[PDB]
Structures are given as structure tokens and as C-alpha cells.
Amino acid sequence: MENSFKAALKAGRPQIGLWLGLSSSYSAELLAGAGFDWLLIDGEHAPNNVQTVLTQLQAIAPYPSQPVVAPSWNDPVQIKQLLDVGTQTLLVPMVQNADEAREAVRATRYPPAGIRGVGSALARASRWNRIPDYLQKANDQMCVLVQIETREAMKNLPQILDVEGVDGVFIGPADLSADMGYAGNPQHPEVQAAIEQAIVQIRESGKAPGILIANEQLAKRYLELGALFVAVGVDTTLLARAAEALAARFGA
Amino acid sequence: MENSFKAALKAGRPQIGLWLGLSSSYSAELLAGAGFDWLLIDGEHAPNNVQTVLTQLQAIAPYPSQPVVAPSWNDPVQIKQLLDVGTQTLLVPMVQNADEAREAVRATRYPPAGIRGVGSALARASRWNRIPDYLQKANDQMCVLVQIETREAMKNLPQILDVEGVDGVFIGPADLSADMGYAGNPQHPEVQAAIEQAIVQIRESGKAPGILIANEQLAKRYLELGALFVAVGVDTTLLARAAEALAARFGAQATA
Amino acid sequence: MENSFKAALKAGRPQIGLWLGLSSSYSAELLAGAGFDWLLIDGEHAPNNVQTVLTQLQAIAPYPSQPVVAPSWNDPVQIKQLLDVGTQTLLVPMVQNADEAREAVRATRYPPAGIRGVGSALARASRWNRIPDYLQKANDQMCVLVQIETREAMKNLPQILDVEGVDGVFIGPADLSADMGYAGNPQHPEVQAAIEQAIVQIRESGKAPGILIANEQLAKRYLELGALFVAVGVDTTLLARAAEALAARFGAQ
Amino acid sequence: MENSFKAALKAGRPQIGLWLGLSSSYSAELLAGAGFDWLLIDGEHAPNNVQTVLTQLQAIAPYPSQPVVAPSWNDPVQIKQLLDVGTQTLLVPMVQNADEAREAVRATRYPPAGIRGVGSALARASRWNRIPDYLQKANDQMCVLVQIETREAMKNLPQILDVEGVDGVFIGPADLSADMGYAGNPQHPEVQAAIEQAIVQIRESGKAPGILIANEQLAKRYLELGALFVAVGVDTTLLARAAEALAARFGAQ
Amino acid sequence: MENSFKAALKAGRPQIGLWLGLSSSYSAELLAGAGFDWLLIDGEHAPNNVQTVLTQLQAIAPYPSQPVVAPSWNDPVQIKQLLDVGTQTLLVPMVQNADEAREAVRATRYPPAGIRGVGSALARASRWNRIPDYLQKANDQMCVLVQIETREAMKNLPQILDVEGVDGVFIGPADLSADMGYAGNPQHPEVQAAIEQAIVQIRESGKAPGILIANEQLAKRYLELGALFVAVGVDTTLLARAAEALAARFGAQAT
Amino acid sequence: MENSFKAALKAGRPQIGLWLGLSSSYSAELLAGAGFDWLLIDGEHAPNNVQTVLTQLQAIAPYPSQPVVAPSWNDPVQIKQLLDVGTQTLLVPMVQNADEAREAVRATRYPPAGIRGVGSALARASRWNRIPDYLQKANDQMCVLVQIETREAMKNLPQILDVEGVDGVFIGPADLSADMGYAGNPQHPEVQAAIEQAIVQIRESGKAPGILIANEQLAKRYLELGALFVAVGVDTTLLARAAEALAARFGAQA
Ligand SMILES: [Ca+2]
Ligand SMILES: [Ca+2]
Ligand SMILES: [Ca+2]
Ligand SMILES: [Ca+2]
Ligand SMILES: [Ca+2]
Ligand SMILES: [Co+2]
Ligand SMILES: [Co+2]
Ligand SMILES: [Co+2]
Ligand SMILES: [Co+2]
Ligand SMILES: [Co+2]
Ligand SMILES: [Co+2]
Secondary structure: OOOHHHHHHHOOOOEEEEEEOOOOHHHHHHHHOOOOOEEEEEOOOOOOOHHHHHHHHHHHOOOOOEEEEEOOOOOHHHHHHHHHOOOOEEEEOOOOOHHHHHHHHHOOOOOOOOOOOOOHHHOHHHOOOOOOOHHHHOHHHOEEEEEEOOHHHHHOHHHHOOOOOEEEEEEOHHHHHHHOOOOOOOOOHHHHHHHHHHHHHHHHOOOEEEEEOOOHHHHHHHHHOOOOEEEEEEHHHHHHHHHHHHHHHOOO | OOOHHHHHHHOOOOEEEEEEOOOOHHHHHHHHOOOOOEEEEEOOOOOOOHHHHHHHHHHHOOOOOEEEEEOOOOOHHHHHHHHHOOOOEEEEOOOOOHHHHHHHHHHOOOOOOOOOOOOHHHOHHHOOOOOOOHHHHOHHHOEEEEEEOOHHHHHOHHHHOOOOOEEEEEEOHHHHHHHOOOOOOOOOHHHHHHHHHHHHHHHHHOOEEEEEOOOHHHHHHHHHOOOOEEEEEEHHHHHHHHHHHHHHOOOOOOOO | OOOHHHHHHHHOOOEEEEEEOOOOHHHHHHHHOOOOOEEEEEOOOOOOOHHHHHHHHHHHOOOOOEEEEEOOOOOHHHHHHHHHOOOOEEEEOOOOOHHHHHHHHHHOOOOOOOOOOOOOOOOHHHOOOOOOOHHHHOHHHOEEEEEEOOHHHHHOHHHHOOOOOEEEEEEOHHHHHHHOOOOOOOOOHHHHHHHHHHHHHHHHHOOEEEEEOOOHHHHHHHHHOOOOEEEEEEHHHHHHHHHHHHHHHOOOO | OOOHHHHHHHHOOOEEEEEEOOOOHHHHHHHHOOOOOEEEEEOOOOOOOHHHHHHHHHHHOOOOOEEEEEOOOOOHHHHHHHHHOOOOEEEEOOOOOHHHHHHHHHHOOOOOOOOOOOOHHHOHHHOOOOOOOHHHHOHHHOEEEEEEOOHHHHHOHHHHOOOOOEEEEEEOHHHHHHHOOOOOOOOOHHHHHHHHHHHHHHHHHOOEEEEEOOOHHHHHHHHHOOOOEEEEEEHHHHHHHHHHHHHHHOOOO | OOOHHHHHHHHOOOEEEEEEOOOOHHHHHHHHOOOOOEEEEEOOOOOOOHHHHHHHHHHHOOOOOEEEEEOOOOOHHHHHHHHHOOOOEEEEOOOOOHHHHHHHHHHOOOOOOOOOOOOHHHOHHHOOOOOOOHHHHOHHHOEEEEEEOOHHHHHOHHHHOOOOOEEEEEEOHHHHHHHOOOOOOOOOHHHHHHHHHHHHHHHHOOOEEEEEOOOHHHHHHHHHOOOOEEEEEEHHHHHHHHHHHHHHHOOOOOO | OOOHHHHHHHHOOOEEEEEEOOOOHHHHHHHHOOOOOEEEEEOOOOOOOHHHHHHHHHHHOOOOOEEEEEOOOOOHHHHHHHHHOOOOEEEEOOOOOHHHHHHHHHHOOOOOOOOOOOOHHHOHHHOOOOOOOHHHHOHHHOEEEEEEOOHHHHHOHHHHHOOOOEEEEEEOHHHHHHHHOOOOOOOOHHHHHHHHHHHHHHHHOOOEEEEEOOOHHHHHHHHHOOOOEEEEEEHHHHHHHHHHHHHHHOOOOO
């Protein structure tokens, strides 16, 4: 049950990812064979739930690409449910301060380190108790990534980076650009300045920076600045744009 | 992406609705062709979730009937999710005061006007970013309808009616009659007085009054008093009652 | 595991039914409480499969109303599958002659009386072998109903009524009226003559006549002539027409 | 509408249960015929939601075994939704004190007794308004069981037992053992001591004690100590362990 | 209930299509807004059934793109079922001769023209009997497209082209190339020759030629030769190829 | 994409299986970790279809246990569909003679060897065209097992064994006992005699015998006789019987 994504990040190995919003275990398997280091199953902005996360985890399982899951909110209940179907790496939206970051971490750990609910007998996570000593091994293989997505989050970043158990800090540019007054224009220089400053600040604390960006040149820039988990595209967009451009080339 | 239901309410055009509790994209399509101005996908009291709301929206889409969604609660996370699958008109249950009404409005609006989370590449709402100016146009096409459903809510109605972004106020007679101590009996005179008083107060404010009522004579009365979005039946009831009546017209059979 | 629909046909007690085409286990439950003697899960003209039939059977189970299933065709493999999920009364479409009726019967019976495939350990039908002597009891609780739906079938009614194991013969007025040249108009005198003649003919053989008809006055006539399983409405129609009438009472009118 | 699990509880009848985590209406039906007094549909630790709870309730309905549902948390909204699809017995997780217990009770009762939202017309719970007088009878048929799963809850037990409407108090050994420093080892003597003490307090207060324990010898011990709703197995475990043993018997030794 | 795809083929307006194998009503909607003239819901080689076809038809409905459905075989029962959920254009696989083509036609028509079973009260196709005189109007709005996919079928093309109610003839290049001994790869001179001669012959008969090909240069060539329904890509391929190229630009490789 | 089950049978290595009729990708995963050599997804007597077969194959994929699928009938179209979602080993019910065996084989092979329809671009089987030279390599990794389940099939067994592409012959005791006149009692000596004779006959032709039997003593005997793919239990039975026995230990009375 070693979490290989977590190990790679701790080792400073950059991981290239794809964001999955098609909410299908079928297209998930198709994309699991595409060569990405990680895949993000989006429970916040795509029509996923615990049940569809489960089937996408099952589809992805035999492939080299590692799954990461975003809950719809920093909710300990939903987090519990996602961990039990086998989620080991979690990308938590809208973490605004160190207290919220701490609660995200505590939501993933069994007592006394946290408040994760115990139900190993019926969890896929323990393979229904086939994994020996699962309850003693689980906490150390959880990888908690928190999203900073507002000015308020930026103010609290130094404190957030001091929270033990926060393995990575992810910058959400859509939300950040909107909160900064540039909605839909994360490429704006003021937003970019905040993003670059944050990436360096995160890496400088010895934690892993991450980000999603559709511009491949920006993605390379962030990697140069020390980003360690970079999502470089989104499935819905890849499909829609490729389809539209094809139709257009035939005058449809 | 302009919200035609919102525009109709703003113009003062009465809209006749059916409540959908069958939680099926199939029956949703069947009912979408029946001639209603609006259909309510009930996420509060029917076994719906974000995924089933999506398929019902897809089913209804080619028809003129406009979808409205009731979330299970005034919860910004659920509202975010419903909006991203394409919900533009929301009927929020159990809005008790103007602070709650304001929170419902803010949940539907992107910053700085609200706290709606941004995920347009993934959203049916933006047609997966096919709408270039989606983020700039979205707020103005959201239609927030708040349900007042308790004695407490009725006391707060004047302040609720001043909340910018509340486009309509809907009276929920089942919850209201129960809160008033008349469960299952909205026909009661004290309940009817609170309802009529509320419709008139809403009307005078310039916002749209709405209500659900299965009694067609009451429905007509409410429309006469100025109600602008009136749901006049429920799919489960229509089906059950028509089926029960039909079986009964044949009754028990003689053994021969 | 007694087939009470079958027993009622044998008692001579007419059974009033509703046709289910909403293809939902939720609306199936709602309608199971509506007071019908039987409910037809339509696998031919509604978007059902073996899986949705199963969930509809589960939904209906605690209610008095008895389920009947129409497969999409007289196909022994599909029939095998529907029986294993627990179907005991079948309404087979487009049965054109005695050969086809015999094949429908044999599809429902274990050897040597037929060719039903054996898989009781897996089957809801046996409650996963919880029911003792299931394999020895099952054949006799099957109720085979065959639809006659064309001029050819009507012509061949006498041979069909001689088939052992055919418990009832059901007239399908939509397909019949179309085949007769009156599509959409089963109320045509020529179609009604064929229907009434058939009902009497079936009644006389000792087998049960059945029919689906949305006109209530016609239904009462068919009952008067001896019909024993009469479906008197369709869920999709009841809902659609009720919704439409309601909207209209508030529209232009 | 009569809640027979609640009735049994009030009569002091010990009820033997099976925990369901397979999240399937198909295996639910198979297990509903197995002879258990009750079945726990786990909304907290199995991949269930309101919709799958509904289908499992429909599957279980015609059997004697009574359903109990664990919501994922003490959340009035989820509780409202679970009640409307027909849940009458709730096993609420992580109830830490008396205030939380009272809020669980209030979430199940209509005004003016509580805050349960009213939507009887489209609820399976009322059979779509086919149950009279549903709204007047519903509150009394709700059965609220609260789970005590931490040292804090154990400390607060005396006060929790004083909450009207709490019909039963359930000890969660997995969560309790972890909270006490023995994760994966509820067998441990000190955990056992805490469990046995709680059962006594509960029984002596006049409320029903409950527990889940897969070790049958410990189950029988808890029953002897006065526990009244005891879940003695988990479907996933029964299936996994049985399959593993079968495979191993055909492998080396 | 007017079948506009049929009307386009009859008018000689070339229709550009995309093949749908993702078997999802969600991606079907996303693709329905991409600007194609038609979309093929593949019930033969993708994990679809009558129920999933229905949901895809519903997702596609409000968009201009017209749905076409390939059943898994020329089976009148499956055809009956597909039609009742609202399919009006069928792409029937492995039609080998004129008799089989005629049987495909008859499966889509009510008596006396065919053997389609009558179930209009519960069919989406009639909008649950809201379309007045549906039973009298339905036949003329059915569009039957037959796939020729073997050397035998190619030999029988002249006779297949003489079958009334066959509105179009589609060449299946993967199956045809396999039958010709090229193991599913149609990019050989002799396969191309067979395809091109067939397109010309179909068009000269006054029927619509169709084809699926992922190579855009070949698609353009087939349009130049008179093909009227050309599918120019497959959803699974577009997605897989787009994703793999993207990973490869960051060094991430699956090859 | 090598079929390891097929290779095992060829090598004469016995494979222990579990029959899956719970029709769930969730329980399929749970049972995939249980230690079996193979798992039978039953499309004939459990409520499965191509779509549910697909999700069970996906669930099973990262485990050692190899999937086998039983179609509902020897139907080329259904076989085509099952193969495209990734099925490589088929257990075909009610194969009665050599013509039927030969047609099962042809249904699994691309031309010229068979009539399997070509749709590689959208098949999980080819992993959407990532498996190089899939169409050229697919035929040799297909494993065709035919079920003999009637007296007629028994009579025709020698010719069935003489059809190339038939990799294994499976005896279906429930159907066979019924056709023989002992419905529900496979244990009857006359059925057992037929079964044992068939097993030796299959082994002697060089091909792999298989059977399903829930009685573990009988299973061991069939293995001793040279059966090479033996299913020793059924998921639904395992679960129902274990649950019932548990309830009964606490007082449950029928
Ligand atoms: Ca510090
Ligand atoms: Ca514009
Ligand atoms: Ca009756
Ligand atoms: Ca000609
Ligand atoms: Ca070879
Ligand atoms: Co964000
Ligand atoms: Co209300
Ligand atoms: Co008919
Ligand atoms: Co617990
Ligand atoms: Co082809
Ligand atoms: Co068999």
C-alpha cells in the first residue's frame, strides 16, 4: 500500500498530471494508459461522488498513473468516505488558513494523530482487511495536498506551510484570479506574480508546490520554479477542443 | 445562456409549473412535452442528487419547459455543484431570514458578488468553455427563488423582500401548515390567511410570488392575487391518483 | 413460490391489470400500491432489460399486485434469463401458431418437459437454493400467456388453443389493428369483431382470454365476454395525459 | 408503517443483526432471507447514498428482517432524505454528547416536535400519501439509535442516556478501540472493560444496548450482559473469509 | 418528427460526422455541441445497449447534430427496440446481399410495408402519442443505411443498390480490409481502389455513399468522390491521442 | 495481453476457480483477491450483460486471478461484444455437436480464421489501439471452452474434441443431470459415471477437462481424474450459506 505519488514528491521528482472531469470509469481507464504520472478525479467541479470515485479508482488501478482525488470541500465526512474506497492522495479545495489545513490533515489520520473514522472490515482501502496491520500503516501513506485559492489563503500561507502533515500546497488559478478581480484571466501579470511568489515560498519551506494550468509554456515555467505536481490539461477540454477543430477543418 | 424563466418573472408573466419527484430522466422527458412553463426537479424530498439532476436537465433541454432545481438545503457546496451541471434557477428550501437569503444569493455568484467556486472548463454550465464570456455573463442569468416555510420565515418576509438578487419568494404550504400546527391541512383558514397575506406582500414589493398547491381552485385564487410561479401538481400524485382511480372503476372481480 | 396469478386464472377470477412502461423500479413501487391485480413489465416496447426487470420485481414483491413480464420476443435464451431473476408469468409477443406457442412453453420448463437451462444456485427464482425442491416444483408454477397479434395468429387460434401449457391467450389490439389495415384504430368495427370472436373462442377452450385496452367501456365488454386478464391502462399514458390536461386547464383554453 | 424493530426493542427482545457493506440491492435481498432480525445498511463506511439506500430498502421489504440505516454523520439534511425514502430506524455515528443526541432525535420528528422537513406527497415513507394519517403517525414510529465511539462519549454516557427519544445506545468498538490507543485491537482487555461497563449503564438506565462484534463468542457474552441489538457479522467479511478458505483448501499445506 | 439527416442526404448535402464509442450521455452532450452534422452511437463495437442509446439520444436532442445508431447486428427485434426509443437513422452492420438489405428495410417499417412491432403509447418515438398520426408518418422518416464490409457484399452492391428504402450505403473499411487480407488496415492501394470504385458506383445509382476514416486526407478524397456521410474521427481516438501527445510534450510517455 | 489461463491449460496445470453470480464490480474486486486461479463471470444464469462484464473485468484486472466469461448462448454477436470489452477466455453453454463447437471458435477469430467483427479503435481489448499489432496477435490469445450439458453432447464428444480451437471441454452437471432425468441430483451414480467417462476421454484427446462442483470431495476426485479447470464454489452460495449458518448459531429457526 506504499503511496508512490507521495514518495516521488518527497524525493523531489516532478509529477505530470491530467485532470479528469468526464466522470466515467471507462474514459478513466482509457486515459490511465496515456502516460501521465498522476490523474486527478475531480469531486468538486465534475459530477462525481464517492461511488464514481470508487469505479474510477478500480479502472486506474493496474496502470502506472497514480490517482489523486479532490473532494467537493474540506469536509471530514466526505474525506472519510473517499479514503475508505481507497483514496490515498487528496487535493482539498479552498483551504484558507492553518486551522483548515490542520483539519484536512486530521481528517486523513486515525486517532491519536487525527479523527479519521475506523471501518476497515468493509473498506476497499484495507482490501477488506487483507492488508496486514492496515490500521497501523495507513496514516503514513496518506498524502495531503491543500489548495490555496484566495488572497486570504495567500495571507495565511506562511502558517499553512508550518502545519505538519501538509505534504503539498496547490495553487488554484481559476479561483485565485477571480478572488483577485481578474476572473477568467489567470494569465494576467498580477495573478502570475502571486502564483510565482507562492510557488517559491512553498518550495522554500520544503513542501511540494502544485498547480493546474492549460498553457503548456506556463506549465514549463512553473516546473522551472520548483513545482512538483503540475497538471497540464483537462480531459473535457482536450476532447471538446480536438473535436471542434476537426469538425471545423471539414467546414462543419 | 439567457435565463428565460427569470426574464418571464421580471416581465410579470405567470408561469405554470409541475413538480418532478419521480427522479427519472425518462419521465422528465415525457413531462417536459406536456406544456408546462416550468418543471421543478426536487432535490430535497425526492431521491435526486447532482448526477440525477444533470440527466433530468439533459432530458428537458430540447423542450420549451424551463427547469428549476430545489437543492436539499441552502448549502453553498451543493449549490456550486448544481450550478456547474447547468442549473440556472434555484428554489432554496427553508430560508428563514434575510441573512440566509443573502447567503443563497452569494452562493450563486462569482466573486466579487459572491462565493461561487470557479471551474468552467469542467462545467456543462459553460458548455465546457465553449461560451467565451461565460464567467462575466453567469451572475446576471442566475435566478434565486427562496422558500418561506415557517411562521418565523413569515415574520422575516419584509426584510427578505429587500435582498438584492432574490428574484422570487415561494410559499411552501406543507412545511408551513405543519409549523403552524396544522400538519397535512393547508386548507385550514389560518394557514390560508398567512398564505394570501404573503402573496400580496410579495406582489407589492415587485418581486415574484410563487407557491405549490394541488387544489386547482386554490391555484386559480393565488394567480388572481398576483402569484407568478405556481406549481399546480406533482408527478407522483398525478400518476398515483390516476392509477388508483382507474383500478377502482373496475373494482373487485366476481369468481366464475 | 406459489403463482397466485396462475391460481386466480384457474379459479376463474378476472384480474385487472396495468401496463408498466416507465422502466423504473421507483414508479413500479408507487404503482404496485395502486390496487391492481397484476402489472405488466414491458420488455418489448419499453426500455427494459433483464436487469431492470429484476429491480422492478424486487420493488413489486411486498405488494398484492402480481407481476407479469413481456419479453421482447419468443426467445428461449431471454426467457431463461427472465425466469432466473424470478419471473413466473410471461406474456410472449407475436406468437403466430402452435409451434411457436409450444416453444414458449418449453422455454419455461426444465427437462424433460422443456429446455429451460438449469442454474438454481445463482437464481433469485430459487432464492439461491433456499427454496427446497425448487427444481421439482418450478415447472408447475410457470404461467405462460401468448399474444395473438396478427391476422395469421387469429386464423391459427384453434391450433394455438390446443397447446398444453398455454395458460392464457392475449389479444394485442395495436399490432392486430395495424396488421388488419387499421393502424391506430382498434375501435374499428372490423377489428372489434375479430377481437370479440377470439375472446369467445378462447373462453370455450377452457383457457383464459386476455387483452390490453385503454377504452374503459370496451374493457367492460371484454370482461362480459369472459376475459380473465384485462389490462385497462398504461402508466406512460396515464401520466402524460393527466399532465397535459392539467397544464391545459391553466393555459389558453 | 409500524416499526417492528422499535417494538421489539421496547419489549426487551434481543435482536440479532447482520451489517451490510456490499452496497448492492441484489446481495441485500439474498441476505434478507438469511434469518436475521435486522440488517444494517451502512451509509458511513460503505459506498452508499440515499439512492442506494432506497433500492436496498425495496429489496429487503418483503422479508421479515428489518432495515436499520447508518447515515454518514449526524446531519439533519441527510437524515431528512433517508427518512423520506422510508428509513424508520437510524444508527447515528459519533454521537459525542447529549446535545448531539437531542439533535439526532429532533432531525427525525416533524414540527412542532422537531425539524424534519415535510414532503409526504412524494415520499416512499408515506407511500406517496397512501398512508393515513401519515404525518400524525410518523414521529412515534421513528427509532433513534446513537453510537458511542470515543472516550469523550463514554464520559458523557450518563447524560446521553437521559435524552428522550434515544431508544438505543450502540457501542462502536473499532472507533472506540482506536480512540483508546488500541487500533485494530478491540479484543484488548482494557477495551473490553470499557465496552462491558457501558452495556451495564445503558441496560440499567432502561434503554437498549447495542454493538457490532464479529467474534461470535464475544457477541454471546454481550447478549448475556444484556445487549439487545447485536450485529454478529459483516457481509463483506463473511464473503471474503469464506472465499479465501475455500481457495486455500485446494492449495498447498 | 421530420428526419433532417435523411433530407440532407436526399438533397446531396455532405454530412460530416463523429463516431461515438465512449458510451456516455455526458460526453455525448459535450460532443454534440462540437459542430458535426451527425454523430454515430455505436451499438456494435462499443459497450452500448438500448438504454444507453436512449440516454445518448436525449443528451444530443437539443443540438443541431443528428444522431445515427449502429445496431449490433441486422436483428429485427433489436431494431424494433432502438426505433421505439426514437432512433430514426440506422447504420446496419454486415449487410451481405440484397435480401439482407431488404430485411433491414422491413424491420423499420410498420405493416403493410414491413414488420415493425406497434407500441406507440409507450414509445419516445411517438412522444408517447403526442405526435398525431405517428403510425401513418413514421415509415417515411426512417433512414436505412447499410454497411458493406466484405468482398461478398462488394460483389452484391449492384443488387443492394436496387433495394427500395436503402437510402445509403456505407463502406466499413476495417472489416473490409480484414476480409481482403489486410488485417483491418485499409491504407493499402488495393483496398483504396475497392473503396473508391464503390463510392463512385453508389453515387451514380442516386444513393448516398458513406464511410468512416480517421485519416483526414483520405476523408477529403472520399468527399471529392461524392461521399455524402463521412465520419472523420472517433471520440475514443481523439481523446486518447490528444492526451498522449500532451503527456509526451512533458516527457511522459506510454508508447 | 498474453492469456495466462490458456497457457496454463495447455501446459496441464490445474486451475482452481470461483463462480461469480453476484453481478457486481465491487464484490468482484473483493473476490479477486481471494486466491483463485480463475473467476467465472456468468452471463447465462446471473443478471449480467456486456456492460457489467466490462466493469467486472476492470475490477479484476490488477489481481492475479484470471477472468473467464460465460455468454448466455453460443451467439456470434454477443461473443463479438464480449471480446471487444476485453474477454479472452469464453465458456460457451450448451455446445451440442461439432458444428456448434466450430462456430464458437470462428466467433472468436478475425478473418480468415473466423468471423469476429473488427473494431479495434474503440475496444478495451486492444486498449484503444495501444497494443501494437493487436489484430495480428489476438486470435492466438483467445481461449475457447465449450460446455457439454446433454446426452446428445456426450454422444458427440469425440468429434467436438476434434475441432481445432476447442481448448477445453467443460461438463455442466446441473443441465446434464436434468437432461438425464435426475434434475437436482448430479450425485446420482449414472450422472457421475457419465462425468467421469467424459473427463478421461477429454484428457486422452490432449485437451483440458473442466467442471463446476460445490462438493469439495467430488472436486478433489475430478482433479485426481485429470480435470484441469475446476470451479469449487459459487459466490452467491458461499454468502447465503455462511449468513444463514451464522444466524442459526444465534437462534434463527427456519
Ligand atoms: Ca513558522
Ligand atoms: Ca456575446
Ligand atoms: Ca383487485
Ligand atoms: Ca441500379
Ligand atoms: Ca500462432
Ligand atoms: Co478552485
Ligand atoms: Co417545504
Ligand atoms: Co403487440
Ligand atoms: Co464507528
Ligand atoms: Co465493421
Ligand atoms: Co449449464
